[PDB]
Design a protein around this ligand. Structure first.
Ligand SMILES: *[C@@H]1O[C@H](CO)[C@@H](O[C@@H]2O[C@H](CO)[C@@H](O)[C@H](O)[C@H]2NC(C)=O)[C@H](O)[C@H]1NC(C)=O
Ligand SMILES: *[C@@H]1O[C@H](CO)[C@@H](O[C@@H]2O[C@H](CO)[C@@H](O)[C@H](O)[C@H]2NC(C)=O)[C@H](O)[C@H]1NC(C)=O
Ligand SMILES: *[C@@H]1O[C@H](CO)[C@@H](O[C@@H]2O[C@H](CO)[C@@H](O)[C@H](O)[C@H]2NC(C)=O)[C@H](O)[C@H]1NC(C)=O
Ligand SMILES: *[C@@H]1O[C@H](CO)[C@@H](O[C@@H]2O[C@H](CO)[C@@H](O)[C@H](O)[C@H]2NC(C)=O)[C@H](O)[C@H]1NC(C)=O
Ligand SMILES: *[C@@H]1O[C@H](CO)[C@@H](O[C@@H]2O[C@H](CO)[C@@H](O)[C@H](O)[C@H]2NC(C)=O)[C@H](O)[C@H]1NC(C)=O
Ligand SMILES: *[C@@H]1O[C@H](CO)[C@@H](O[C@@H]2O[C@H](CO)[C@@H](O)[C@H](O)[C@H]2NC(C)=O)[C@H](O)[C@H]1NC(C)=O
Ligand SMILES: *[C@@H]1O[C@H](CO)[C@@H](O)[C@H](O)[C@H]1NC(C)=O
Ligand SMILES: *[C@@H]1O[C@H](CO)[C@@H](O)[C@H](O)[C@H]1NC(C)=O
Ligand SMILES: *[C@@H]1O[C@H](CO)[C@@H](O)[C@H](O)[C@H]1NC(C)=O
Ligand SMILES: *[C@@H]1O[C@H](CO)[C@@H](O)[C@H](O)[C@H]1NC(C)=O
Ligand SMILES: *[C@@H]1O[C@H](CO)[C@@H](O)[C@H](O)[C@H]1NC(C)=O
Ligand SMILES: *[C@@H]1O[C@H](CO)[C@@H](O)[C@H](O)[C@H]1NC(C)=O
Ligand SMILES: *[C@@H]1O[C@H](CO)[C@@H](O)[C@H](O)[C@H]1NC(C)=O
Ligand SMILES: *[C@@H]1O[C@H](CO)[C@@H](O)[C@H](O)[C@H]1NC(C)=O
Ligand SMILES: *[C@@H]1O[C@H](CO)[C@@H](O)[C@H](O)[C@H]1NC(C)=O
Lengths: 378, 219, 364, 49, 50, 50
């Protein structure tokens, strides 16, 4: 892995960052509410008389079990567009409140029920915000709403005109019924959801969790915080969840992160040996997966700790170095130098009787390579 | 009369716990050191953007509010009441007395004379603050009950208001009133504007102090 | 950028090698931080220790010498200094030298200078009594040695009383060390606070674009986050290069002051304090070094009248190493920085020429 | 960036603290230019004549 | 339709300002090394003999 | 269509080039400090005794 990181076949002595340690998780756990109250859409999608286009209706679907699959696959809908969220992932999310608006328009006016359109319908009958989130559903209803002689009961604002619907109208002039579902998320504690698909729960163990919408990873622990009521969690400093409330039992649990860090490889050089030692940086040496040695800089594997002290060779950190000495690899607290007491007294002096001439070198970079790049040709 | 709030009408902007963190928010607040009407004992007021509302007594003369646009039929309105039993939220089309109240025998409730088309029901000294707001068809109510050591004057101090209710009505509101228990045998009204505040959070997660960032150069 | 999600991680591969460059840059600046410390403090070969019985001529170094009953074996003034001043892909590496090792280095420098003068920075340490070293340093600023030996107790009392005031003024100023800590923390916080901006997307969470969008529509929204987060990380890495190039020059100046003020006596003006440099003492600080500069300052001046030369027997006499002065009626020679008048003789003057070319000659 | 317009300011608000960093960077430079001059020229206690 | 173009304008104009500020940072560190040399010259060549 | 694909290449390559030039400017300033120190050593160590 070091040879691959450097892109070479000979690594010289050093210490190299090679990858990262990510304590993978295990066992997932959902946590929806005490499911029960289902949703009878068969009132808004099964009405005997719809509502005008200039006074649309507005039903506020609420806490329930919504199954958008019976909608999505019913194949009876001529138009099913989802904007904030693709359709298949609806039965796996939870919001605060779903609104359903209902009305009746012409056939070729269904393209103005979309975010950012213009026309007599979207201008002043029914306007969709520019960051819509829900889905728009529409189906033809020629046999129900159009009657011989003209059905003049379906008006629109243009101040009011009436579609005169008649059964012998070309498509694009026959009545279409439209339902606009708009999922909103204020700031409550929770609301409607999906089939859920069962659930479970655990503790102490890197895990992959979902708490009625909150998707995350980490270790869960008994949240012994002063977490008051009228809440649903609490993202402390930095703005991180760092805590949740279990919907079913209503207890606070902290979500510390999952252990991880960097991985370094210590080598004496391939021209000396092919043995290697490995540093897991600031990881406790009990959660890594001989010589396992704990350092202030992480957990070291593959080197033995000695009690001697040498000059530093390969720097590990916090005063610890490594060397290939004692045919192997070992750690130790580098030495600063040999000790020396000077024979100080108040009437003693040391005077030299000889000398040496010394010559030493000093090297300094003066210049570098002059390069130009044509910005256009690059 | 008019009076001066000092640091009053701070509510928790939402759920989500929190500790020592001078957190900054933009929302609808009652500005510090404001000009709050004074009422003694009442008339139809405006709403226009939320409302602060305090009150002081040991008996219970303040017996809820009534909201809406017209406070009559032909359009819908809310009604929040409390007899000596407990709270009664209600949403119908009403016919409200232009001077509606309740008596204190102890027979009462000359408030309305109509309860048609009800679309929502519910049944079941002192300083009592309330913050009323109405956003996206939701009528939010924050509240707090502090004990004064006076009887009926607006005190000074800091006390954050905790959310109480949430009603998915859809109702339009432009006006509101009050309800009082007559004699047969003091309250204020602030308004809320879009301000930016700096809230100081305790280690238990309560708001202990705040800064209004548009008062003066120091703030 | 991605936070352990394979969808974002595959889109990121399309950007080439930006993230190997960023790591190379940060590694290059984390190695030179240990190189910075090594060249300020490892300026000794031996670890010198001071003698058990400490009689340095009346001078008292007890507040700057190591204290065994203290934490990390620091001096008393090294403690006042250390009292005054795990996430998502972000880690902090420890320095190679601990604080104990750096306090060891400064106590070896300080025991070398108290005990050998400037000899240990040129070769083997040769001991000399402390007052004779002080007399050599007085010679180096142009005062004679009898001025130290006749004022020993006063000079030692002034030194002790002036070391006693550093301790008060600090115990009761390390803004240059506080600012580099603050700047780094303010930048690391701005880096994390950017993980919650949209940059023109529907949310800031990848588990929210991967939950209400189909894969063909979530690519366009994930790329908007990738571009923003890459920009923010690369801004962080540029400003660290520019801040490290400034810390490097400060450490290069500290390494020169350790050589020229602690292992020598400097003649450069205002390089090792204000006054005439006598000696310097190092102390370690959290991410830096404090120098205590001891200088000589002249005081209590008088005026006299001067002449450039003296005429006598038709010859012109100039002082060998002083100035001719007059107290009103008599003519003496002093040394130029300390008043100590002497009779003008042929032992402290020399002759050149006759006394009609100099302007200002006096007869004496 | 924007410059008067208001459709621009709300869109730029989506980029976080990019503009706060730049103003801090430029303010540090301007405070350093006065310290440069104080260090070169104000090297004297008294104003001598 | 307009938000799309305004985001391109914003991106370009923010890139220009970052280029400007980074170069001012690099150019001020060069002026500081020069004022440091001037301070040492004023100390050592004007307030003394070198 | 060619234009929309060419613009992403232009955007990526411009950023590559800018990173190269900024890191050359930071490295040339380090080489200049070294060359000033070597000039000072040439004057003070070869043309005199220090
Ligand atoms: C509205 O109600 C009708 C009748 O209950 C539902 O129609 C059923 O649709 C399924 C699937 O297409 C058919 O297998 C049944 O035969 C239909 N019912 C009858 C009586 O034949 C319709 O699904 C409902 N609409 C919605 C949106 O739920
Ligand atoms: C959701 O339902 C479960 C049961 O289906 C409730 O669990 C009960 O919790 C109480 C604790 O107050 C226990 O005494 C019961 O024995 C539990 N019942 C079972 C079957 O385990 C749970 O409390 C419900 N959720 C809420 C919020 O009340
Ligand atoms: C050097 O100075 C120190 C003062 O910092 C002297 O130590 C203290 O002296 C006072 C006065 O007698 C005592 O109360 C303290 O207990 C001493 N020790 C401390 C403060 O740690 C010290 O005696 C002086 N050295 C000599 C040789 O006189
Ligand atoms: C040196 O002699 C000069 C000459 O008198 C003194 O300077 C004068 O001092 C008086 C009183 O302080 C002032 O009023 C004059 O303005 C000074 N300048 C002149 C007269 O030119 C000076 O005090 C003497 N210095 C010392 C150290 O005694
Ligand atoms: C200048 O200094 C000389 C010192 O040599 C002073 O002259 C001597 O003063 C003492 C005491 O007044 C006498 O005992 C000597 O007899 C004097 N002469 C000699 C040759 O020593 C002189 O007074 C001083 N002048 C001034 C103005 O202070
Ligand atoms: C310094 O001493 C010389 C010699 O004693 C003086 O020179 C004499 O000056 C007088 C008066 O001007 C003349 O009459 C003599 O002819 C000079 N002799 C010689 C050999 O030059 C000189 O004037 C004295 N200087 C002062 C300022 O008194
Ligand atoms: C590298 O290998 C060559 C030949 O194999 C040998 O001469 C040299 O000593 C080796 N270097 C080290 C550091 O062992
Ligand atoms: C690693 O975990 C064990 C178990 O709690 C603990 O005893 C040990 O101190 C930890 N490591 C460090 C370096 O503290
Ligand atoms: C090192 O010395 C200590 C002395 O406290 C001793 O306890 C320890 O066993 C020694 N280590 C080895 C590997 O011998
Ligand atoms: C409140 O406003 C009214 C409006 O006229 C004014 O008369 C009164 O003085 C104001 N009160 C305060 C406390 O500013
Ligand atoms: C209190 O008022 C409500 C309002 O309708 C009413 O339903 C309730 O019965 C009243 N309490 C009693 C005890 O009648
Ligand atoms: C509301 O009440 C009026 C009068 O009682 C009635 O005409 C009307 O139909 C009611 N509203 C609805 C939606 O039924
Ligand atoms: C509230 O009144 C306004 C009057 O401008 C009206 O346009 C709006 O539709 C009303 N609210 C609802 C939910 O209808
Ligand atoms: C609440 O806060 C107080 C003071 O901040 C603290 O003493 C107490 O432990 C906290 N928790 C409580 C009262 O449950
Ligand atoms: C000094 O100036 C005075 C004027 O007061 C003059 O008489 C004398 O000759 C001058 N002496 C010298 C040495 O310049």
């Amino acid at each position: 892995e070091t040879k691959c990181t450097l892109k070479s076949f000979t690594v010289e002595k050093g210490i190299y960052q090679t990858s990262n340690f990510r304590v993978q998780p295990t066992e997932s756990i959902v946590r929806f509410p005490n499911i029960t109250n289902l949703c009878p859409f068969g009132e808004v999608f099964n009405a005997t008389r719809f509502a005008s286009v200039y006074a649309w209706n507005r039903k506020r679907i609420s806490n329930c079990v919504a199954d958008y699959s019976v909608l999505y696959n019913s194949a009876s809908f001529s138009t099913f567009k989802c904007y904030g969220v693709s359709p298949t992932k609806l039965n796996d999310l939870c919001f605060t409140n779903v609104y359903a608006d209902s009305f009746v328009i012409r056939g070729d006016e269904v393209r103005q029920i979309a975010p950012g359109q213009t026309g007599k319908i979207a201008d002043y009958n029914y306007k969709l915000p520019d960051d819509f989130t829900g889905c728009v559903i529409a189906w033809n209803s020629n046999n129900l709403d159009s009657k011989v002689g003209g059905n003049y009961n379906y008006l629109y604002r243009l101040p009011l005109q009436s579609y005169g619907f008649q059964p012998t109208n070309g498509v694009g002039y026959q009545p279409y019924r439209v339902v606009v579902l708009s999922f909103e998320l204020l700031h409550a504690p929770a609301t409607v959801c999906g089939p859920k698909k069962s659930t479970n729960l655990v503790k102490n163990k890197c895990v992959n969790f979902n708490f009625n919408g909150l998707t995350g990873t980490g270790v869960l622990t008994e949240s012994n915080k002063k977490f008051l009521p009228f809440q649903q969690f609490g993202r402390d400093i930095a703005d991180t969840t760092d805590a949740v409330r279990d919907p079913q039992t209503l207890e606070i649990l902290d979500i510390t992160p999952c252990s991880f860090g960097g991985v370094s490889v210590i080598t004496p050089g391939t021209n000396t040996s092919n043995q290697v030692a490995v540093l897991y940086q600031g990881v406790n040496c009990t959660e890594v997966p001989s010589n396992v040695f704990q350092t202030r800089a992480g957990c070291l594997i593959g080197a033995e700790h000695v009690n001697n002290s040498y000059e530093c060779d390969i720097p590990i950190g916090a005063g610890i170095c490594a060397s290939y000495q004692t045919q192997s690899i070992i750690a130790y607290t580098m030495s600063l130098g040999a000790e020396n007491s000077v024979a100080y007294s108040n009437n003693s002096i040391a005077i030299p009787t000889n000398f040496t001439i010394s010559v030493t070198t000093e090297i300094l970079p003066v210049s570098m390579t002059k390069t130009s790049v044509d910005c256009t040709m690059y | 009369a008019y009076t001066n709030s000092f640091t009053r009408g701070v509510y928790y902007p939402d759920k989500v716990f929190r500790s020592s963190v001078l957190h900054s928010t933009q929302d609808l607040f009652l500005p510090f050191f404001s000009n709050v009407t004074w009422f003694h004992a009442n008339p139809v007021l405006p709403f226009n953007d939320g409302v602060y509302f305090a009150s002081t007594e040991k008996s219970n003369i303040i017996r809820g509010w009534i909201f809406g646009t017209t406070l009559d039929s032909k359009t819908q309105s809310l009604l929040i009441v409390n007899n000596a039993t407990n709270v009664v939220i209600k949403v119908c089309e009403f016919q409200f007395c232009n001077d509606p109240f309740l008596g204190v025998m102890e027979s009462e409730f000359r408030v309305y004379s109509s309860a048609n088309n009800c679309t929502f029901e519910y049944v079941s000294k002192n300083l009592r603050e309330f913050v009323f707001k109405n956003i996206d068809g939701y009528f939010k109510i924050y509240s707090k009950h502090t004990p004064i050591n006076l009887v009926r004057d607006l005190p000074q101090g800091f006390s954050a208001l905790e959310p109480l209710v949430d009603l998915p009505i859809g109702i339009n509101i432009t006006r509101f009133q009050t309800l009082l228990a007559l004699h047969r045998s003091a309250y204020y009204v602030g308004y809320l504007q879009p301000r930016t505040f700096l809230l100081k959070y305790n280690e238990n997660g309560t708001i202990t102090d705040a800064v209004d960032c548009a008062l003066d150069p120091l703030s | 950028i991605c936070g352990d999600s394979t969808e974002c991680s595959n889109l990121l591969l399309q950007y080439g090698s930006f993230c190997t460059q960023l790591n190379r840059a940060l590694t290059g600046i984390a190695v030179e931080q240990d190189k910075n410390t090594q060249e300020v403090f490892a300026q000794v070969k031996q670890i010198y220790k001071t003698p058990p019985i400490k009689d340095f001529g009346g001078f008292n170094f007890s507040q700057i010498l190591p204290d065994p009953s203290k934490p990390s074996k620091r001096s008393f003034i090294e403690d006042l200094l250390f009292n005054k001043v795990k996430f998502n892909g972000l880690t902090v590496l420890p320095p190679l030298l601990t604080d104990e090792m750096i306090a060891q280095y400064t106590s070896a420098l300080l025991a070398g200078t108290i005990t050998s003068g400037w000899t240990f920075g040129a070769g083997a340490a040769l001991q000399i009594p402390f007052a004779m070293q002080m007399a050599y340093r007085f010679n180096g600023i142009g005062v004679t040695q009898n001025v130290l030996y006749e004022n020993q107790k006063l000079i030692a009392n002034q030194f002790n009383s002036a070391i006693g005031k550093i301790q008060d003024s600090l115990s009761s100023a390390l803004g240059k060390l506080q600012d580099v800590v603050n700047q780094n923390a303010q930048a690391l916080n701005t880096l994390v606070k950017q993980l919650s901006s949209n940059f023109g997307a529907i949310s800031s969470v990848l588990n929210d674009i991967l939950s209400r969008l189909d894969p063909p529509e979530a690519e366009v929204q994930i790329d908007r986050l990738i571009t923003g987060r890459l920009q923010s990380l690369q801004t962080y890495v540029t400003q660290q290069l520019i801040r490290a190039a400034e810390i490097r020059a400060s450490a290069n100046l500290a390494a020169t002051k350790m050589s020229e003020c602690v292992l020598g006596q400097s003649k450069r003006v205002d390089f090792c304090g204000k006054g005439y440099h006598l000696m310097s003492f190092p102390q370690s600080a959290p991410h830096g070094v404090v120098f205590l500069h001891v200088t000589y300052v002249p005081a209590q001046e008088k005026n006299f009248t001067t002449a450039p030369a003296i005429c006598h027997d038709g010859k012109a006499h100039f002082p060998r190493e002083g100035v001719f002065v007059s107290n009103g009626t008599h003519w003496f020679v002093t040394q130029r920085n300390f008043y100590e008048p002497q009779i003008i003789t042929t032992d402290n003057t020399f002759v050149s020429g006759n006394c009609d070319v100099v302007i200002g000659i006096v007869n004496n």
